[PDB]
Amino acid sequence: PWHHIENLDLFFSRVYNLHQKNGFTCMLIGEIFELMQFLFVVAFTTFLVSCVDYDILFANKVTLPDAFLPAQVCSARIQENGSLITILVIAGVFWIHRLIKFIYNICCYWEIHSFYLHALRIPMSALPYCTWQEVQARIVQTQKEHQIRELTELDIYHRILRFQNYMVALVNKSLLPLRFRLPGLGEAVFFTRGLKYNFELILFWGPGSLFLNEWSLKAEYKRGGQRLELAQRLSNRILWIGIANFLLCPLILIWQILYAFFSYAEVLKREPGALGARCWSLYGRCYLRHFNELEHELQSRLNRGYKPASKYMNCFLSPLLTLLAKNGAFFAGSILAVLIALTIYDEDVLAVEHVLTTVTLLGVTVTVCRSFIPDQHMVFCPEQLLRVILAHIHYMPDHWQGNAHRSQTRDEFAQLFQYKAVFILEELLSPIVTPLILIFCLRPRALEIIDFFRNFTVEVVGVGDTCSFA
Amino acid sequence: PWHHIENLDLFFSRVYNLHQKNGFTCMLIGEIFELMQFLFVVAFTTFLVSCVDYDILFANKVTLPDAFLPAQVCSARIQENGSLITILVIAGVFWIHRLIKFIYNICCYWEIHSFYLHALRIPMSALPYCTWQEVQARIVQTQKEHQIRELTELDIYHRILRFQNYMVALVNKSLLPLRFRLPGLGEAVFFTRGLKYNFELILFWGPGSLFLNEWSLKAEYKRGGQRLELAQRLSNRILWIGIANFLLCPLILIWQILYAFFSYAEVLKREPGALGARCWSLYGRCYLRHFNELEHELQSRLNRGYKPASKYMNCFLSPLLTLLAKNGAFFAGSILAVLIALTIYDEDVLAVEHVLTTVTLLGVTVTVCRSFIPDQHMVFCPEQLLRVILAHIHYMPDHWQGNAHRSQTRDEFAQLFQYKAVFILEELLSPIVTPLILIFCLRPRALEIIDFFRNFTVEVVGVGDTCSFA
Amino acid sequence: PWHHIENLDLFFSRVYNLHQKNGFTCMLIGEIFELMQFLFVVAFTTFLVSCVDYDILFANKVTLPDAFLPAQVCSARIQENGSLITILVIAGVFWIHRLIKFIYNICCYWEIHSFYLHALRIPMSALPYCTWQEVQARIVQTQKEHQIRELTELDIYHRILRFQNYMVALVNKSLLPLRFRLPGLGEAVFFTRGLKYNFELILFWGPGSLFLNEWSLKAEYKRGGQRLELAQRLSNRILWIGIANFLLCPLILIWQILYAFFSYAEVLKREPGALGARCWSLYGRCYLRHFNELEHELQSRLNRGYKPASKYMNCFLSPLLTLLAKNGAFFAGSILAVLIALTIYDEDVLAVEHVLTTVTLLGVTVTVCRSFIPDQHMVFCPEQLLRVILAHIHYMPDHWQGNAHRSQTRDEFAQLFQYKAVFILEELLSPIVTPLILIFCLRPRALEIIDFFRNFTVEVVGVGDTCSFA
Ligand SMILES: CCCCCCCCCCC(CCCCCCCCCC)(CO[C@H]1O[C@@H](CO)[C@H](O[C@@H]2O[C@@H](CO)[C@H](O)[C@@H](O)[C@@H]2O)[C@@H](O)[C@@H]1O)CO[C@H]1O[C@@H](CO)[C@H](O[C@@H]2O[C@@H](CO)[C@H](O)[C@@H](O)[C@@H]2O)[C@@H](O)[C@H]1O
Ligand SMILES: CCCCCCCCCCC(CCCCCCCCCC)(CO[C@H]1O[C@@H](CO)[C@H](O[C@@H]2O[C@@H](CO)[C@H](O)[C@@H](O)[C@@H]2O)[C@@H](O)[C@@H]1O)CO[C@H]1O[C@@H](CO)[C@H](O[C@@H]2O[C@@H](CO)[C@H](O)[C@@H](O)[C@@H]2O)[C@@H](O)[C@H]1O
Ligand SMILES: CCCCCCCCCCC(CCCCCCCCCC)(CO[C@H]1O[C@@H](CO)[C@H](O[C@@H]2O[C@@H](CO)[C@H](O)[C@@H](O)[C@@H]2O)[C@@H](O)[C@@H]1O)CO[C@H]1O[C@@H](CO)[C@H](O[C@@H]2O[C@@H](CO)[C@H](O)[C@@H](O)[C@@H]2O)[C@@H](O)[C@H]1O
């Protein structure tokens, strides 16, 4: 590929994304699936609402296609529902918008698919078996062939990760709200995934934002006098985008409930210790992140620190919770063992009214409670394995060096390394909470955001306008 | 709490028990559960015996409350059963005796709940997150405030554990029987949990025992001439308590069978490798115990030595047992795989007569046999990982230093680290065996018990009459 | 046992086999089982074909013995099937041949059962708890008692393993074919278990082979002139044995399909991650084998190298396979979670037509796909844990010292450490492929086989004719 390309940020970000998606054809059949996964969840849940007759399926030998309605009625009953057509049109417009954007990506990743072949000499077979240090070093020393002088291996880092080094400095300085006292829990920590998307939509995307192009910001934000007129323009902007989150609040809420039922409700019956496992929260991914550190380099420490940190949390379980788990598993296991031994004896105490759903619900009640009960012979693991976690993730809040066994070291660590089911809970609440905390919580901090981009923005001569901390 | 308390043994034992039950309100809602767990097992098994009509439940659409009898017949059919009323009265008298004793404990632990707050400055929130070295050091250096001179940190150990340092010396000297040749197994080792309770009821509880109070013993047992008249008083005493175990034998036997069915019979269907796991036996807990070593300090080595010792036993499995397990799992898995593939084909070979209980019983037959089969790729673990177990539990019988692979190192170690299902078996046999071995086996050793408390009882000036070995 | 035995190879091979089968009575009840396991698979699958009436079992309250036919019809319908009688006679002749050979082994292992008792002083109780270094040293220093002069501890190794040191040198020199390009996979590696049996039937068993007795070979194969007349005798011999594999091809094919259904088809429903586990292939067992190294000494490194090598293969999983596994588990788990939550709601959407087999087949579809999905938090294990595997298994093909992350280090290692399900696949194909590659692939290599036994056969004065490499 060719002489003096127009955008060295969107180019290098797609060179990196092609390597991490393990090739062109793997990313292509990958991103087909999420367009099909959106289309499956919307079309199958619309068929369940309108076109399955449950009176035949519940009460009234019957076959499984006897419940289903014919296609001349399947397409008819769906249309005298003005709410559901309004759901299907706005879902349909968003989907064809996501279909146009995908065809635009195939034309653009094919030009970088040919960058590996014809300029870096790396096939799509050898590409999942290269590291990034392979792919990066091909770009650096072949710059005599393609212009695209002696940049650095560092100046490719500032271009792939320019707008990620701002979210590191906005979280470490608490210029984004991220934490709220509510009565009942204490100090809760927000910053879910749909909230981080808005923070760059306030700050980095569009003509009316900062950053007129993707590599330099406005000249407005470097002049002084503290410019409350310039800080006011950001202040009403969070309104018009925050009102947009409030009007689109009911339709993102429908999507998060549908997606959680289709991807977690069967895992509840089999293995509810899966949802009792923990995962590094998005607040923790922005707290343990370094400056100019790629997305696969963050994960290489967050997989190595997963194994100690998941057993650090297991040796702090609540005495009141374990005690309710052991005696709740006794009372449910005792009526199971009566019903289990009564089914083995005669096998006709099944098909009496509620017995088969009672074994199903008591069997998952016992399965939940066995997850809450820790290991009986759990080595209580002298609680400076926190110096093993500090070797992998490199930031501890400094109160934790000798106080590793308290509750001001256990409750602050669960803000970084939350449950899986709390992560499920914060994604369903996310359409509700996000327009409230942009309007009421982010707008008072607008004068410190505008002053942040004045004082900490350093222009480096090759890359452009970077964060000062990075 | 106040000046010169009357009983420094029962006080310090409850200071320790309040810390290990993780607080007042955790122990309170804890001990409510065992009063409810006794009341659940007795009332639910009485309802199953007398008030469920199984002819409607087995043979004669039916609902699950159609089997149950109405309350005017539920309370009527229970009374023309003179055995069951006799069961319910003696269970009822024992339960209200256990209810009076619990209300007496709330009044006494509340006085020690206020000892943490108003004398040690430790709340109930900070208490599960303290160690005993926290709680002990609060008691030691605040003795200028409360009298309760410069005792030691050692003299609190002799008071919490006075009657546990005797059971260490009575087991290590074999003054308690604990081992019996029966034809068929070899030398079996008893000492279950209801037997250890009686040994302190012969020796430490009551006015007619030794130890007139809880901290000093009689003057009778220090005089000499070997006192067969004094050894006779113990000899008929084991009769009157051993006859009491024989008369109360049928009602403790009913309780152990009921409790094992309500807490282990559903674990058989799911996971019978749970009952093939091993646990440190009560003979092992008194054999590996040190002198003046608290109950949580014994468990801290018995959890660290659990992980090597459970895989030391897995690399000694019987060749005759593995061979019957592999070929028994073939013959049962082959008729499963016919019946599994015959259910997938048509799904109406269910609801023909015994097929669904056959899949249930062959499925647990295969599940039992897969537990008996060891790992195919089991590293045969060079059998001096016995020097890893010796690091955690500190006593080996000295034959085992180089002979770690024989059967006189495997069968003596399973006396310390028995199966779980053998522990189940020794609790059901425990009402049967215990009155027999007090009358016939303990009474011949009464002259050596009386001479033991003459020769090994040292009076220390702060604590009182302690064991000489401790 | 007595003076100057006639065959020191078959004696020492049975002294070793008695130790590895853990005794006389363990081997006796062991080898009864495989005669019963052959008889179970043949008789139970014959009853399923001819004597179960499925029209009563599928469509037409019924009992499970109502499907079965009476014995006067059970023995009648089996006889108007000229294919099945031909199957049962040839299975019956092979079984009574395997029954005569077993009674001949009881008479011969009893003479070596008395060799442990009356000449080595080792009972059958102490025998599973001895090592081979116990059993070998008993034979070596008691040679003053039994003649059976100062042989070596090495000269017992050449006698137990004489015909196994040839198969090491025939595989390392590629005088046996073992590898074939087919379009679609690349270079595949054969050498299944029924193929290795034939290679010693061409070379070591019979009067018409090499090795006139079990300890010395013919004088024919040491003379020179390259002897194409002598290489022709081997060339037509592989025909007459290869035609025998082709005529007996349909009846060994029936046995491998029957045995795989009776021992793996129920493991598919429970745990299909079992068949996704890997096992050291038979090509790998002959590639990592040393010279004069016993069968239990090979396994002691292949169990220690099992644990790193099974996680070396898990960190090379295909990006296209993981991506189809995650999105296939979404689409199947979403229709499960609808059907699971629809059964909990009413419990009468069971017994509508195909729902219960749909939960069964989608439940195993999700279970298969969760096996293909790797660990999310898998430490990517810096790929020179290949220096941990090289410590246990002692041969690496030398391209792998620094190239541990490519596909020419992953695909050559799966030839040594193949899947379990590929091992299942190569045993069902084994009756088909084996007569083809003896006739068409082994006969062109006959002149290099005849020249191999001329140049590499060294006569040692105690043992006889051994391989030169060993
Ligand atoms: C001015 C107006 C403001 C506009 C409002 C903004 C509110 C955003 C809502 C859009 C929304 C719901 C759409 C529902 C459609 C409703 C239509 C009707 C439906 C029928 C009634 C899209 O849809 C999401 O649905 C999720 C499933 O529900 C998917 O799963 C997810 O993955 C699973 C596997 O790991 C997990 O389980 C789990 O992680 C998820 O579940 C997501 O992949 C998918 O993007 C949620 O937005 C999401 O978009 C993505 C970008 O692709 C954003 O990621 C960004 O990526 C980088 C980018 O720079 C940056 O690094 C960073 O910025 C950010 O990480 C997210 O931040 C998030 O915001
Ligand atoms: C002169 C006359 C002699 C009197 C006879 C003495 C015979 C003793 C029998 C009383 C009995 C059966 C009562 C049945 C009631 C029948 C009424 C009718 C019922 C309806 C027909 C009580 O009941 C027990 O029932 C058990 C369940 O069945 C409970 O589970 C248990 O925990 C589970 C969780 O780990 C486990 O699974 C498993 O470990 C158990 O299962 C026990 O907690 C409970 O105490 C068994 O006695 C038991 O009492 C306890 C003390 O509380 C004793 O512990 C002591 O504690 C310290 C104390 O100093 C000392 O350290 C030490 O001494 C000792 O450790 C035991 O030794 C034992 O003896
Ligand atoms: C001139 C003419 C040539 C003759 C043709 C030769 C073709 C050989 C076919 C005979 C055959 C099928 C017989 C079916 C009977 C059909 C009758 C009608 C049936 C009704 C229609 C026997 O039957 C086998 O059936 C298998 C199950 O199907 C068994 O399971 C196995 O174990 C399971 C547990 O680990 C596993 O899961 C799995 O490993 C198997 O599955 C075997 O144990 C059993 O031997 C397959 O042969 C086998 O025999 C054995 C020797 O005993 C051979 O082992 C040898 O041992 C040493 C010896 O020196 C040497 O070290 C070496 O040489 C070799 O290792 C094998 O090499 C193999 O060849």
Coordinates of N, CA, C and O in Angstrom, one line a residue, chain A residues 22 26 29-30 33 36-37 40-41 44 48 54 57-58 61-64 128-129 259 261-263 265-267 269-270 302-304 306 356-357 360-361, chain C residues 316 319-320 323-324 327 330-331 333-338 340-342 344-353 355 366 370 376-379 405-407:
Chain A
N22 N -7.3 -12.1 14.2 CA -6.6 -13.3 13.7 C -6.8 -13.5 12.2 O -6.7 -14.6 11.7
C26 N -11.3 -14.5 9.3 CA -11.8 -14.8 10.7 C -12.6 -13.7 11.2 O -13.6 -13.8 11.9
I29 N -16.0 -13.6 9.0 CA -17.1 -14.5 9.5 C -17.4 -14.3 11.0 O -18.4 -14.7 11.5
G30 N -16.5 -13.6 11.7 CA -16.7 -13.1 13.0 C -17.8 -12.1 13.1 O -18.8 -12.2 13.8
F33 N -21.4 -12.9 12.4 CA -22.2 -13.5 13.5 C -22.9 -12.5 14.4 O -24.0 -12.7 14.7
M36 N -25.8 -11.4 12.7 CA -26.8 -12.5 12.8 C -27.3 -12.7 14.3 O -28.5 -13.0 14.5
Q37 N -26.4 -12.4 15.2 CA -26.8 -12.5 16.6 C -27.8 -11.4 17.0 O -28.7 -11.7 17.8
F40 N -30.9 -12.6 15.3 CA -31.6 -13.7 15.9 C -32.4 -13.3 17.1 O -33.5 -13.7 17.3
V41 N -31.8 -12.5 18.0 CA -32.4 -12.1 19.3 C -33.7 -11.2 19.0 O -34.7 -11.4 19.7
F44 N -36.4 -13.8 16.9 CA -36.9 -15.0 17.6 C -37.7 -14.5 18.8 O -38.7 -15.2 19.2
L48 N -41.8 -15.3 19.5 CA -42.3 -15.8 20.8 C -43.4 -15.0 21.3 O -44.3 -15.5 21.9
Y54 N -49.9 -20.3 23.2 CA -49.5 -21.1 24.4 C -50.6 -21.9 24.9 O -50.3 -22.9 25.7
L57 N -49.9 -25.1 23.7 CA -48.7 -25.6 24.2 C -48.7 -26.0 25.6 O -48.0 -26.9 26.1
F58 N -49.6 -25.3 26.4 CA -49.7 -25.6 27.8 C -50.7 -26.6 28.1 O -50.5 -27.7 28.7
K61 N -52.3 -36.6 21.2 CA -50.9 -36.1 21.2 C -50.7 -34.9 20.3 O -51.2 -34.8 19.2
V62 N -50.1 -33.8 20.9 CA -49.9 -32.6 20.3 C -48.4 -32.5 19.8 O -47.6 -33.2 20.4
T63 N -48.2 -31.8 18.7 CA -46.8 -31.6 18.2 C -46.3 -30.2 18.5 O -47.1 -29.3 18.8
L64 N -45.0 -30.1 18.4 CA -44.4 -28.8 18.6 C -44.7 -27.8 17.5 O -44.9 -26.6 17.8
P128 N -2.4 -15.7 12.5 CA -2.7 -16.0 13.9 C -1.6 -16.6 14.8 O -1.7 -16.7 16.0
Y129 N -0.5 -17.0 14.1 CA 0.7 -17.6 14.8 C 1.9 -16.6 14.8 O 3.0 -17.0 15.2
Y259 N -31.1 -9.8 26.0 CA -29.8 -10.4 25.8 C -29.3 -11.2 27.0 O -28.5 -12.1 26.8
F261 N -31.3 -12.8 29.1 CA -32.1 -14.0 29.2 C -31.6 -15.1 28.1 O -31.7 -16.3 28.4
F262 N -31.1 -14.6 27.0 CA -30.7 -15.5 25.9 C -29.3 -16.0 26.1 O -28.8 -16.9 25.4
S263 N -28.5 -15.5 27.1 CA -27.1 -15.9 27.2 C -26.7 -16.2 28.6 O -25.6 -16.6 28.9
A265 N -29.6 -17.5 31.1 CA -30.7 -18.1 31.8 C -30.6 -19.6 31.8 O -31.2 -20.3 32.7
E266 N -29.8 -20.2 30.9 CA -29.7 -21.6 30.9 C -28.4 -22.0 31.7 O -28.3 -23.1 32.2
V267 N -27.5 -21.0 31.9 CA -26.4 -21.3 32.8 C -26.8 -21.3 34.2 O -26.1 -21.8 35.1
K269 N -29.5 -22.9 35.4 CA -29.9 -24.2 35.7 C -28.7 -25.2 35.9 O -28.7 -25.9 36.8
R270 N -27.8 -25.2 34.9 CA -26.7 -26.0 35.0 C -25.7 -25.6 36.1 O -25.5 -26.4 37.1
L302 N -4.0 -9.4 33.3 CA -5.2 -9.7 33.9 C -5.7 -11.1 33.7 O -6.7 -11.5 34.3
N303 N -5.0 -12.0 33.0 CA -5.2 -13.4 33.0 C -4.2 -14.1 34.0 O -4.6 -15.1 34.6
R304 N -3.0 -13.5 34.2 CA -2.1 -14.0 35.1 C -2.4 -13.7 36.5 O -2.1 -14.4 37.5
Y306 N -5.6 -13.3 37.5 CA -6.9 -13.9 37.7 C -6.9 -15.0 38.7 O -7.9 -15.1 39.5
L356 N -42.1 -32.6 39.5 CA -40.9 -32.6 38.6 C -40.3 -31.2 38.6 O -39.1 -31.0 38.4
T357 N -41.2 -30.1 38.8 CA -40.6 -28.8 38.9 C -40.1 -28.5 40.3 O -39.3 -27.6 40.5
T360 N -36.6 -29.9 40.2 CA -35.9 -28.9 39.4 C -35.5 -27.7 40.1 O -34.3 -27.3 40.1
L361 N -36.4 -27.1 40.9 CA -36.1 -25.9 41.6 C -35.4 -26.1 42.9 O -34.6 -25.3 43.3
Chain C
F316 N -3.2 -23.4 21.6 CA -3.1 -23.3 20.2 C -4.4 -23.5 19.5 O -4.4 -23.9 18.3
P319 N -8.6 -20.1 15.8 CA -9.5 -19.0 16.0 C -10.8 -19.1 15.3 O -11.8 -18.6 15.7
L320 N -10.8 -19.8 14.1 CA -12.0 -20.1 13.4 C -12.9 -21.2 14.2 O -14.1 -21.2 14.0
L323 N -14.4 -19.3 17.4 CA -15.5 -18.4 17.0 C -16.7 -19.1 16.6 O -17.8 -18.5 16.8
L324 N -16.7 -20.3 16.0 CA -17.8 -21.0 15.7 C -18.4 -21.7 16.9 O -19.6 -22.0 17.0
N327 N -20.4 -18.7 19.1 CA -21.6 -18.3 18.4 C -22.5 -19.5 18.2 O -23.7 -19.3 17.9
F330 N -24.2 -19.8 21.6 CA -25.2 -18.8 21.9 C -26.6 -19.2 21.3 O -27.6 -19.1 21.9
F331 N -26.5 -19.6 20.0 CA -27.8 -20.0 19.3 C -28.5 -21.2 19.9 O -29.7 -21.3 19.8
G333 N -27.9 -22.2 23.2 CA -28.3 -21.9 24.6 C -29.4 -20.9 24.7 O -30.0 -20.8 25.8
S334 N -29.8 -20.2 23.6 CA -30.9 -19.3 23.7 C -32.2 -20.0 23.5 O -33.2 -19.5 24.1
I335 N -32.2 -21.1 22.7 CA -33.5 -21.9 22.6 C -33.6 -22.9 23.7 O -34.7 -23.3 24.1
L336 N -32.5 -23.3 24.4 CA -32.6 -24.0 25.6 C -33.2 -23.1 26.7 O -34.2 -23.5 27.4
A337 N -32.7 -21.9 26.9 CA -33.2 -21.0 28.0 C -34.6 -20.6 27.8 O -35.3 -20.3 28.8
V338 N -35.1 -20.6 26.6 CA -36.5 -20.4 26.4 C -37.3 -21.7 26.8 O -38.2 -21.6 27.6
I340 N -36.1 -24.2 28.8 CA -35.9 -24.4 30.2 C -36.9 -23.5 31.0 O -37.6 -24.1 31.9
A341 N -37.0 -22.2 30.7 CA -37.9 -21.4 31.5 C -39.3 -21.6 31.2 O -40.2 -21.2 31.9
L342 N -39.6 -22.3 30.0 CA -41.0 -22.7 29.7 C -41.4 -24.0 30.4 O -42.6 -24.2 30.5
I344 N -40.2 -24.8 33.5 CA -40.3 -24.4 34.9 C -41.7 -23.7 35.1 O -42.3 -23.8 36.2
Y345 N -42.2 -23.0 34.1 CA -43.4 -22.2 34.2 C -44.6 -23.2 34.3 O -45.5 -22.9 35.2
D346 N -44.7 -24.2 33.5 CA -45.9 -25.0 33.4 C -45.7 -26.5 33.5 O -46.6 -27.2 34.0
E347 N -44.5 -27.0 33.1 CA -44.2 -28.5 33.2 C -45.1 -29.4 32.5 O -45.2 -30.6 32.7
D348 N -45.9 -28.8 31.5 CA -46.6 -29.6 30.6 C -46.2 -29.3 29.1 O -46.9 -29.7 28.2
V349 N -45.2 -28.5 29.0 CA -44.5 -28.4 27.7 C -43.5 -29.5 27.5 O -42.8 -29.6 26.5
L350 N -43.3 -30.4 28.5 CA -42.8 -31.7 28.3 C -44.1 -32.5 28.0 O -45.2 -32.1 28.2
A351 N -43.8 -33.7 27.3 CA -44.9 -34.5 26.7 C -45.7 -33.8 25.6 O -46.8 -34.2 25.3
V352 N -45.1 -32.7 25.0 CA -45.5 -32.3 23.7 C -44.2 -32.7 22.8 O -43.1 -32.7 23.3
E353 N -44.5 -33.0 21.5 CA -43.8 -34.0 20.8 C -42.3 -34.1 20.9 O -41.8 -35.2 21.4
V355 N -40.0 -32.0 22.5 CA -39.3 -31.1 23.4 C -38.3 -31.7 24.2 O -37.2 -31.1 24.4
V366 N -24.6 -27.6 23.5 CA -24.0 -26.6 24.3 C -22.8 -27.2 25.1 O -21.8 -26.5 25.3
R370 N -19.0 -25.7 24.8 CA -18.2 -25.2 25.9 C -16.9 -25.9 26.1 O -16.0 -25.4 26.8
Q376 N -11.3 -18.4 29.3 CA -11.2 -16.9 29.0 C -10.0 -16.3 29.6 O -9.4 -15.4 29.0
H377 N -9.6 -16.8 30.8 CA -8.5 -16.2 31.6 C -7.3 -17.1 31.5 O -6.5 -17.2 32.5
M378 N -7.2 -17.8 30.4 CA -6.1 -18.8 30.2 C -4.8 -18.0 30.1 O -4.7 -17.1 29.2
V379 N -3.9 -18.1 31.1 CA -2.5 -17.6 30.9 C -2.0 -18.3 29.6 O -2.0 -19.5 29.4
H405 N 6.0 -21.8 18.8 CA 4.7 -21.2 18.7 C 4.1 -21.2 17.3 O 3.0 -20.6 17.0
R406 N 4.7 -21.9 16.3 CA 4.2 -21.9 15.0 C 3.2 -23.1 14.8 O 2.7 -23.6 15.7
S407 N 2.9 -23.4 13.5 CA 2.1 -24.5 13.2 C 2.9 -25.7 12.7 O 2.3 -26.8 12.4

